[PDB]
Design a protein around this ligand. Structure first.
Ligand SMILES: CCCCCCCCCCCCCCCCCC(=O)OC[C@H](CO[C@@H]1O[C@H](CO[C@H]2O[C@H](CO)[C@H](O)[C@H](O)[C@H]2O)[C@H](O)[C@H](O)[C@H]1O)OC(=O)CCCCCCCCCCCCCCCCC
Ligand code: CLA
Ligand code: CLA
Ligand code: CLA
Ligand SMILES: CCCCCCCCCCCCCCCCCC(=O)OC[C@H](CO[C@@H]1O[C@H](CO)[C@H](O)[C@H](O)[C@H]1O)OC(=O)CCCCCCCCCCCCCCCCC
Ligand SMILES: CCCCCCCCCCCCCCCCCC(=O)OC[C@H](CO[C@@H]1O[C@H](CO)[C@H](O)[C@H](O)[C@H]1O)OC(=O)CCCCCCCCCCCCCCCCC
Ligand SMILES: CCCCCCCCCCCCCCCC(=O)OC[C@H](CO[C@@H]1O[C@H](CS(=O)(=O)O)[C@@H](O)[C@H](O)[C@H]1O)OC(=O)CCCCCCCCCCCCCCC
Ligand SMILES: CCCCCCCCCCCCCCCC(=O)OC[C@H](COP(=O)(O)OC[C@@H](O)CO)OC(=O)CCCCCCCCCCCCCCC
Ligand SMILES: CCCCCCCCCCCCCCCC(=O)OC[C@H](COP(=O)(O)OC[C@@H](O)CO)OC(=O)CCCCCCCCCCCCCCC
Ligand SMILES: CC1=C(/C=C/C(C)=C/C=C/C(C)=C/C=C/C=C(C)/C=C/C=C(C)/C=C/C2=C(C)CCCC2(C)C)C(C)(C)CCC1
Ligand SMILES: CC1=C(/C=C/C(C)=C/C=C/C(C)=C/C=C/C=C(C)/C=C/C=C(C)/C=C/C2=C(C)CCCC2(C)C)C(C)(C)CCC1
Ligand code: OEX
Ligand SMILES: [Cl-]
Ligand SMILES: [Cl-]
Lengths: 30, 34, 82, 504, 34, 57, 36, 341, 37, 63, 33, 38, 57, 33
């Protein structure tokens, strides 16, 4: 149960990277 | 006990000289303050 | 801006400062040398001289053992070096 | 929109709902105490106060009810070990559900003051806007505190109208709840004198009432009112938080060092009792008194109570746990069930050897036997190629006196070594490691967990004092500095006084 | 024109006077034979 | 650069037994205590990888 | 207020400190604290 | 118009070194803590408390000089000069470690004075007191390490000693006895330090490489005057650079500079909590599942067990002299050693 | 009952969600080994 | 705003918001108690620390 | 390995509870104007 | 009776007041001499 | 086996480690500074035993 | 009693997961208009 718990958290942090980059809030100028 | 006299001495004449050269410029400062 | 005190640039480049401090700085330096040369530094703070660490046949540290009679315990240690 | 860390700021100008929220935190804290007590009752073994007391089972709120006179249960037992006593309603179960149904009523009180928040009482008559006269409220709330402080010490601790408090002998053996008379002399400031605890809730009760009457009838000076921002409620949070962590550091300091308010039969022994061999000297003193009176060695150690010998065991040392070694002490070494007696080590030449005890610093300590003078005479060596003091080489034996092994002697090196390893912990006890599935790793007592909890809470609240303290005085620039700040103010030497345009 | 004895004067001489004194004492220690 | 130079075994300052009394007794300093903790790590690391009294690599 | 140049005192005070610290590094090889 | 407001005016005079009401506590306490350390490391010994030399007069260099903590028998005594231990003798006061409490306590109120100095000056010039709030981390670090930790153990003896080499011994003591590297509160503290060093270098370098050409000199330092209203470096160019190189990038200057406050300040606070736990020996020393497995499987080995063997070596070899009051005597045959070495 | 004028709306933009999700996911990965122990 | 029965009885207590005593008021008297309070705290601290040892007091478990 | 039994639910709730707190606040912000 | 430690308590107490007495005593005198023109 | 003395060291989660203790173990001391790609081992099983992945990473 | 070891986390997630799904929908609805 431990090994599944560590890799599951690791996978969420990697999935969090994909959204924080390609689905960020666009910075716009004015 | 003589060792304190030898250690402390240089400070008296060093201050005594540093004083001796500043009174004409040290008393001019307090007379202006009042 | 400025604060009102004389700048350090013209003080240390004036003669009056150096006539005063060419005797004051050297006198304190020798006042410090004579603090150790006279052996008085050893006796003010109670620091062991190179020959006052152990006795002639002793190899155990004079470590303080009691809180409220440490003042007396070291006075026994320094007396057993005669 | 409000950020998440400012969502509760909608109560600053709303006293009624600030009341409703404060009623909710009170109902939560009260509700926790009842459920924490009910939970400890359903997991407590009251069948052995000598070797399996409350501080060996991880009881947290149970000693605090015992400290103030609640010692019995409706089921028929008491923490003292007595049986067949009626505690009435104020038993552990009565105290628990009292906090529980107090929680429910505070919950309903919060609902009312939330819906009916717009009361005339919270409105300032002259302006009509919400206001709270903080200076007079302090004098009112301080007056009530002095009354309850006086009454608590006057009637409860003394025993006129109450049970008293927990008191015990210097070795935590015959503890009980007794009335205590106040100590008015200088010894009343001894933290180990219970009479000083009584003389304080009496004396401080008197002064609190006097100060309350002052802080009610005497308005604050305007130089103190404006300097401390007494019109802003946040200055009370800044000062109250300051006074709260000041008390938190002391209740953590007295828990670790020990005092009359932290008994050993409730929170367990202290770390400093093992350092100074506090319990070992008393045990040896009774042995020498018994041997001097003509008793044999077996009868001298048999006279030692097992409760006195259990305190001389490093497993009860609160400084031997771990941050994540979770659970009671019985999860560690096991449930203590029997003292097997005092072991005495001798070589082949007759001399008695003494095992060097493990200091609290070491997770593991070697096994070294010395005589009565400090010189090494036996050990369990690491490398064997050049060993000189092994048990086999010196013929070291072990003999027990008292306990269950009273009058036995072992000689074969394997078993003699096994008793020497336990001897670095102090007296040797038999444990039950199968009931709780113990792992054999030491854990700390409620005394250790209390100190760790409140020392950290004290340090964190110091930041709360500084943050909410800066908010009180830098209220004006909390949203930024003046966008039209004249550079002459911060220019050096432009004004004679920093930030004072009156002094060019 | 300018003053001579100010608070800046005291702050300087509180650290300058003992420092030169210590630089002389430590200097004499370099010749202490055992 | 500190790790890159100590790779070629130019180690930190060695003040072991550097203070000594008028007779010849070693007056320990805080550097001699550091040498004690260092000896504890050195004699334990890789407890079977060595066959000879010096660990030169 | 400047009868002696600043670069002169900068070098004199610079040469002055070079010697005093060098006296300290020299003392590491002689007398006490020299392991010999 | 009274004497109080007259004294208030003099303290807040815009001079070369600002005094202020906080200076009455800051200047004398900061001058004695430092001067006490300089007096100790130059002249004072630690022979009767630790068995060590620790001054320049005895032959120590800048690295080995230290003001050692008092002996272990002194307990948590304040060791006042007029106290019941020294009984007024200044010589015996230095010989038992009075200067250590003289430096720790005067230095503690000195830190309080400096933080009050940050609150006082911030109010006079009309700024937000975020600099004072940031100084709370070095204070929580000093209190937990030098005061809360020794108060949890046996005496001031096991507190840090004010010396360069005495501090290195402090870390190795925490490795061998506490396994302080494994504690997750030191790990977060490490992340707050190395992270703040990352932000400090990456922000200053990004600013230096995204500036506007506001001058005609090859050294772009003279192209700035403090009284502008326009930004000196391009924020939108630095955002696109780091968006394509790293993935994300700052887009708000106010958030960026608050983030540089939160990361290093929070890191030190977390490491202070871990030290408060160690005062009671509440360590993160072991993983129970590992030890249950390794005890019954002589072939299971991880870097966790290898480091514990190193801890067992540090304790058994440094204890007899680092803790001389215990009178430890370990024969050669009980010392944990590997092969050959 | 007349409504309460002290009420304010709460916000949490997209960037603050990523930062918060990153904090607790890393704090979990760090502390999980000590929870299992 | 809404009036209540208990709200009308407690009205005089929450009625002097913003009132102050002129000038420094009782501040000199407060500072005297503050000094007496620290000296008190200093005594009980030095007694607990065994710095101040009185005749009759015995800061130990054998008290 | 013989790990703690409550460690699983300790990690699971340690992740879940503060996660949904931020998610609720975000979705209610984008549904505004 | 007055124990030796109680005697030192009074010595440090007065020593704390003389340095605080002498501390202030000079700053009020200096502040009176060197006021601020308004 | 990092130290090359036929004493393997567990480093992966599936072999009894957590995030704190897990590690990719350096290559064997029997290799030293020798280049050790996958195609220099007679198989993957030999490659994993001698710390092959450490060099590739 | 010797219950299922995962019945605790199975029940905890049986409640938590669909509960916060409905909470997320309700809070974002009230925040509209
Ligand atoms: C924060 C930001 C602001 C910064 C603040 C600035 C710092 C201000 C300076 C603070 C001064 C603190 C001095 C504390 C001295 C101390 O404690 O002195 C220690 C003494 C206790 O003395 C010790 O007590 C021990 C217990 O002994 C007792 O038990 C023994 C066992 O049997 C014997 O019986 C013995 O006779 C009996 O006295 C041993 O005797 C030790 O030798 C002796 O030193 O307590 C006492 O003075 C009183 C202790 C009760 C008050 C505790 C509050 C202070 C400590 C807070 C931290 C506690 C945390 C614990 C660590 C976790
Ligand atoms: C003052 C607070 C306090 C104290 C001292 C105790 C003490 C104790 N309780 Mg109790 N408890 C408390 C509050 C407290 N409790 C509360 C509020 C609850 C309700 C949830 C409980 C519920 C409870 C139960 C149900 C039981 C106990 C038990 C115990 C014992 C075991 C202690 C243990 O293993 O700790 C372990 C402590 C830790 C592992 C430390 C945790 C540290 C955390 C993880 C740090 C988090 C880091 C942070 C999130 C990072 C921030 C990052 C930053 C960037 C923001 C001990 C006597 C047990 C017992 O023995 O009873 C028989 C038991 O069965 N307690
Ligand atoms: C009785 C004590 C007390 C009280 C009444 C307040 C009240 C307040 N604080 Mg303060 N604060 C306190 C102590 C206190 N604080 C302490 C001790 C610290 C230092 C750790 C701080 C640090 C602090 C900062 C830095 C800030 C505030 C702010 C605020 C305001 C908004 C708080 C809010 O909405 O949080 C909302 C909180 C949440 C939605 C979730 C909190 C998540 C926490 C970290 C985990 C929960 C743990 C657990 C449930 C709490 C029980 C702890 C228990 C063991 C004691 C409010 C006026 C803010 C302010 O000034 O507003 C303008 C602000 O920026 N506080
Ligand atoms: C703001 C400045 C400041 C502060 C906060 C401190 C703070 C401290 N110093 Mg330090 N000190 C200072 C400046 C300061 N010092 C200066 C300038 C010097 C140079 C002379 C010293 C020299 C010095 C020495 C040599 C020693 C200390 C020590 C101490 C500690 C104990 C002090 C104590 O108990 O006094 C107690 C005094 C008070 C609390 C004053 C209260 C007085 C009130 C107003 C009542 C007045 C009584 C009244 C007159 C009635 C008379 C009493 C009668 C019955 C006899 C403490 C940490 C000791 C130390 O660190 O030991 C480890 C120590 O040995 N100090
Ligand atoms: C809404 C829900 C709220 C969120 C729920 C999230 C819970 C996550 C909390 C994670 C903590 C889990 C760690 C313990 C793991 C475990 O096995 O626990 C299990 C332990 C209990 O221990 C278990 O229970 C039994 C005892 O009856 C036996 O001992 C078992 O063997 C033992 O495993 O749980 C507790 O002890 C809970 C109470 C914790 C009390 C700690 C108070 C002191 C801590 C000081 C806090 C200061 C921190 C400041 C930091 C800044
Ligand atoms: C005018 C300004 C006044 C300001 C006062 C400032 C107070 C703070 C000053 C800090 C001084 C601390 C360094 C003292 C070193 C010393 O005296 O060595 C004096 C020692 C004396 O040398 C020793 O003397 C002994 C005699 O018994 C033996 O001979 C030893 O072998 C020999 O080593 O010299 C050294 O150790 C040489 C190394 C020099 C150390 C370099 C310091 C680098 C540290 C920089 C960080 C300090 C930050 C302060 C910045 C200012
Ligand atoms: C160890 C025991 C503890 C003992 C404690 C007792 C010591 C307490 C020390 C308190 C510190 C007092 C600092 C006074 C410095 C001083 O020289 O004042 C400055 C004054 C006046 O200078 C004036 O100075 C002014 C500038 S400034 O204030 O000095 O910065 C300027 O405005 C003005 O024109 C000029 O006349 O100097 C003199 O009076 C010259 C004689
Ligand atoms: C670390 C050092 C800081 C940067 C180095 C100096 C820059 C070097 C530089 O560029 O500036 C030199 C600076 C300016 O000198 P002058 O006033 O001569 O100005 C030069 C021209 O402007 C001519 O007017 O002089 C000083 O700052 C002297 C410092 C004496 C200060 C000694 C300390 C006494 C005060 C005590 C400090 C108290 C602070 C309060 C905290 C407690
Ligand atoms: C012995 C150690 C050798 C250290 C060499 C000097 C360290 C300087 C480089 C630090 C790297 C900082 C990260 C980039 C930070 C960065 O980009 O800095 C850029 C910074 C500003 O440079 P400018 O472009 O203004 O002009 C410097 C030259 O480019 C002259 O045109 O460069 C300097 O200050 C150079 C001065 C070195 C003189 C000393
Ligand atoms: C309504 C009502 C009622 C009812 C009531 C009830 C039923 C109550 C309950 C209550 C309760 C039953 C409560 C509870 C509470 C709890 C709490 C309050 C808790 C909390 C906790 C915490 C907060 C903790 C935290 C933590 C953790 C978890 C871990 C570690 C860390 C810490 C410690 C922080 C009655 C009928 C009576 C009456 C009428 C009305
Ligand atoms: C404790 C005490 C006290 C006090 C004292 C004092 C306050 C002192 C001071 C002292 C001082 C105040 C001293 C000083 C010192 C200094 C020094 C010793 C310095 C040196 C340095 C040098 C030598 C330099 C070096 C360097 C650097 C830094 C950088 C780079 C370069 C070089 C390397 C050059 C009293 C009596 C009050 C009371 C009781 C006790
Ligand atoms: O492998 Mn890893 O650590 Ca560099 O020394 Mn030699 O080899 Mn081993 O012992 Mn020490
Ligand atoms: Cl290793
Ligand atoms: Cl070899």
């Amino acid at each position: 149960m431990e090994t599944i718990t560590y890799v599951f958290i690791f996978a969420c942090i990697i999935a969090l990277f994909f959204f924080a980059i390609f689905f960020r809030e666009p910075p716009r100028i004015t | 006990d003589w060792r304190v006299l030898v250690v402390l001495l240089p400070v008296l004449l060093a201050a005594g000289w540093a004083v001796r050269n500043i009174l004409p410029y040290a008393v001019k400062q307090v007379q202006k303050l009042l | 801006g400025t604060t009102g005190e004389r700048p350090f640039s013209d003080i240390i480049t004036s003669v009056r400062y150096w006539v005063i401090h060419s005797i004051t700085i050297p006198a304190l330096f020798i006042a410090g040398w004579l603090f150790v040369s006279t052996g008085l530094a050893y006796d003010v703070f109670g620091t062991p001289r190179p020959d006052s660490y152990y006795a002639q046949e002793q190899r155990s540290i004079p470590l303080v053992t009691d809180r409220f009679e440490a003042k007396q315990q070291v006075e026994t240690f320094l007396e057993q070096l005669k | 929109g409000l950020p998440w860390y400012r969502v509760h700021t909608v109560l600053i100008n709303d006293p009624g709902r600030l009341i409703a929220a404060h009623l909710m935190h009170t109902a939560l804290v009260a509700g926790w105490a009842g459920s924490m007590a009910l939970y400890e009752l359903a997991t407590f073994d009251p069948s052995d106060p000598v070797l399996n007391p409350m501080w060996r089972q991880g009881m947290f709120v149970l000693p605090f009810m015992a400290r103030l006179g609640v010692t019995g249960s409706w089921s028929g037992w008491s923490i003292t070990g007595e049986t067949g006593i009626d505690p009435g309603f104020w038993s552990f179960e009565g105290v628990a559900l009292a906090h529980i149904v107090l929680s429910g009523l505070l919950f309903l009180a919060a609902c009312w003051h939330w819906v009916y928040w717009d009361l005339e009482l919270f409105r300032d008559p002259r302006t009509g806007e919400p206001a709270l006269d903080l200076p007079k409220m302090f004098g009112i709330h301080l007056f009530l505190a002095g009354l309850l402080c006086f009454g608590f010490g006057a009637f409860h601790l003394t025993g006129l109208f109450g049970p008293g408090m927990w008191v015990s002998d210097p070795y935590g053996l015959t503890g009980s709840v007794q009335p205590v008379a106040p100590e008015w002399g200088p010894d009343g400031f001894n933290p180990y004198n219970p009479g000083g605890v009584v003389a304080h809730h009496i004396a401080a009760g008197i002064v609190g009432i006097i100060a309350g009457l002052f802080h009610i009838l005497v308005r604050p000076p305007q130089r103190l009112y404006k300097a401390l921002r007494m019109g802003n409620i946040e200055t009370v949070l800044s000062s109250s938080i300051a006074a709260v962590f000041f008390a938190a550091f002391v209740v953590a300091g007295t828990m670790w060092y020990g005092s009359a308010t932290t008994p050993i039969e409730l929170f367990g022994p202290t770390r400093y009792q093992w350092d100074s061999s506090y319990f070992q000297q008393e045990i040896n003193r009774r042995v020498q008194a018994s041997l001097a009176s003509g008793a044999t060695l077996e009868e001298a150690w048999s006279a030692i109570p097992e409760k006195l010998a259990f305190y001389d065991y490093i497993g009860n040392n609160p400084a031997k746990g771990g941050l994540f070694r979770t659970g009671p002490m019985n999860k560690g070494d096991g449930i203590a069930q029997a003292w097997k007696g005092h072991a005495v080590f001798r070589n082949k030449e007759g001399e008695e050897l003494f095992v060097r005890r493990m200091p609290a610093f070491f997770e593991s300590f070697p096994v070294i036997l010395t005589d009565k003078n400090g010189v090494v005479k036996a050990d369990i060596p690491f490398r064997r190629a050049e060993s000189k003091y092994s048990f086999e080489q010196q013929g070291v034996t072990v003999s027990f006196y008292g306990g269950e092994l009273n009058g036995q002697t072992f000689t074969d090196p394997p078993t003699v070594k096994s008793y020497a390893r336990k001897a670095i912990f102090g007296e040797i006890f038999e444990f039950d490691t199968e009931t709780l599935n113990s792992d054999g790793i030491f854990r700390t007592s409620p005394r250790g967990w209390f100190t760790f909890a409140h020392a950290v809470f004290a340090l964190l609240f110091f930041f709360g004092h500084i943050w909410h303290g800066a908010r009180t005085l830098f209220r004006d620039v909390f949203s930024g500095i003046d966008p039209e700040l004249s550079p002459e103010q911060v220019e050096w030497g432009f004004y004679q006084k920093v930030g004072d345009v009156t002094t060019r | 024109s300018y003053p001579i004895f100010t608070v800046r004067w005291v702050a300087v001489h509180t650290l300058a006077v003992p420092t030169i004194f210590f630089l002389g004492a430590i200097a004499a220690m370099q010749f202490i034979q055992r | 650069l500190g790790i890159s130079t100590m790779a070629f075994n130019l180690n930190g300052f060695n003040f072991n037994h550097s203070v000594i009394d008028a007779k010849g007794n070693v007056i320990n300093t805080w550097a001699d205590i550091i040498n004690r903790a260092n000896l504890g790590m050195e004699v334990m690391h890789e407890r079977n990888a060595h066959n000879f009294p010096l660990d030169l690599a | 207020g400047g009868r002696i140049p600043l670069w002169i005192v900068a070098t004199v005070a610079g040469m002055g400190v070079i010697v005093i610290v060098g006296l300290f590094f020299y003392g590491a090889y002689a007398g006490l604290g020299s392991s010999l | 118009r009274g004497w109080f407001d007259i004294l208030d005016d003099w303290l807040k005079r815009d001079r070369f070194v600002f005094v202020g009401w906080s200076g009455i506590l800051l200047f004398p306490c900061a001058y004695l803590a430092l001067g006490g350390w300089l007096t100790g490391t130059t002249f004072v010994t630690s022979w009767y408390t630790h068995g060590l030399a620790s001054s320049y007069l005895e032959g120590c260099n800048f690295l080995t000089v230290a003001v050692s903590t008092p002996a272990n028998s002194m307990g948590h005594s304040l060791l006042l000069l007029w106290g019941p231990e020294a009984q007024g003798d200044f010589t015996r006061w230095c010989q038992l470690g009075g200067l250590w409490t003289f430096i720790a306590l005067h230095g503690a109120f000195g830190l309080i004075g400096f933080m009050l100095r940050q609150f006082e000056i911030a109010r006079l010039v009309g700024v937000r007191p975020y600099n004072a709030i940031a100084f709370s981390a070095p204070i929580a670090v000093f209190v937990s390490v030098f005061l809360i930790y020794p108060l949890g153990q046996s005496s001031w003896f096991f507190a840090p000693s004010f010396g360069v080499a005495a501090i290195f011994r402090f870390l190795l003591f925490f490795q061998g006895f506490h396994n302080w590297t494994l504690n997750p509160f030191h790990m977060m503290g490490v992340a707050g330090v190395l992270g703040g060093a990352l932000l400090c270098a990456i922000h200053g370098a990004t600013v230096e490489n995204t500036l506007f050409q506001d001058g005609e000199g090859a050294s772009t330092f003279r192209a700035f005057n403090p009284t502008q209203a326009e930004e000196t470096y391009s924020m939108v160019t630095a955002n696109r650079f780091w968006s394509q190189i790293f993935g994300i990038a700052f887009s708000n200057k106010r958030w960026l500079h608050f983030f540089m406050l939160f990361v290093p300040v929070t890191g030190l606070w977390m490491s202070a909590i871990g030290v408060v736990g160690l005062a009671l020996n509440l360590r993160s020393y072991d993983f129970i599942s590992q030890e249950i497995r390794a005890a019954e499987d002589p072939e299971f080995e991880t870097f966790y067990t290898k480091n514990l063997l190193l801890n067992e070596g540090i304790r058994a070899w440094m204890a007899p002299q680092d803790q001389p009051h215990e009178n430890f005597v370990f024969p050669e045959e009980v010392l944990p050693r590997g092969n050959a070495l | 009952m007349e409504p309460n004028p002290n009420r304010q709306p709460v916000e949490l933009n997209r960037t603050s969600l990523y930062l918060g999700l990153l904090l607790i996911l890393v704090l979990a990965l760090l502390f999980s080994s000590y929870f299992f122990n | 705003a809404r009036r209540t029965w208990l709200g009308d009885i407690l009205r005089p207590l929450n009625s002097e918001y913003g009132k102050v005593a002129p000038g420094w008021g009782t501040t000199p008297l407060m500072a005297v108690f503050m000094g007496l309070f620290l000296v008190f705290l200093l005594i009980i601290l030095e007694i607990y620390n065994s710095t101040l040892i009185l005749d009759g007091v015995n800061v130990s478990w054998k008290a | 390995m013989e790990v703690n039994q409550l460690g699983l639910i300790a990690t699971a709730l340690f992740v879940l509870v503060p996660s949904v707190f931020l998610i609720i606040l975000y979705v209610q912000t984008e549904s505004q104007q | 009776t007055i124990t030796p430690s109680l005697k030192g308590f009074f010595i440090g107490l007065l020593s704390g007041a003389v340095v605080l007495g002498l501390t202030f005593a000079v700053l009020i005198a200096i502040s009176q001499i060197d006021k601020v023109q308004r | 086996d990092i130290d090359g003395i036929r004493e393997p060291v567990s480093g992966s989660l599936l072999y009894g480690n957590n995030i704190i203790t897990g590690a990719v173990v350096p290559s064997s001391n029997a290799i030293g500074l020798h280049f050790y790609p996958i195609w220099e081992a007679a198989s993957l099983d030999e490659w994993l035993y001698n710390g092959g992945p450490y060099q590739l990473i």
